[PDB]
Design a protein around this ligand. Sequence first.
Ligand code: NI
Ligand code: NI
Lengths: 81, 81
Amino acid sequence: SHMEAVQNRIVEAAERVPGVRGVIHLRARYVGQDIWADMIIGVDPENTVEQAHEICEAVQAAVCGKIRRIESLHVSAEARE
Amino acid sequence: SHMEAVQNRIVEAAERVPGVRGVIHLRARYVGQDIWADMIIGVDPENTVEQAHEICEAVQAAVCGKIRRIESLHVSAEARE
Ligand code: NI
Ligand code: NI
């Protein structure tokens, strides 16, 4: 439930990035005191693959800048209406 | 040093509020799993007392909204150049 607080922070930080149409999936786990996390964001189907990659990379920087314990974060994108 | 992370978050959140001219002082302590904290912000000497009170109250809401473990936060203001 310290983990719930962290997950909340991840979702919230991802959701503030331009182009994010929700957090579709988030798995977070501790590896010692560090967090490793895997997430899928929604994106406009009409974005280019390159734009979706940009948004992912912006999510990664936004989330890692906010949540200093994260030491690995993978972000993928899926079309969401 | 989990406390350092929390203090950092408090300062950072206070500093993003309009009218804050730094965090002059921050004392934070755990009361169980909750944080109680006392802070002093800088404010423009030419602000009114009422504006300084507004900024304090905005700091309180900004910090408490960001840092869910805080259950008591006092914010005061001092002139800062
Ligand atoms: Ni690239
Ligand atoms: Ni008032």
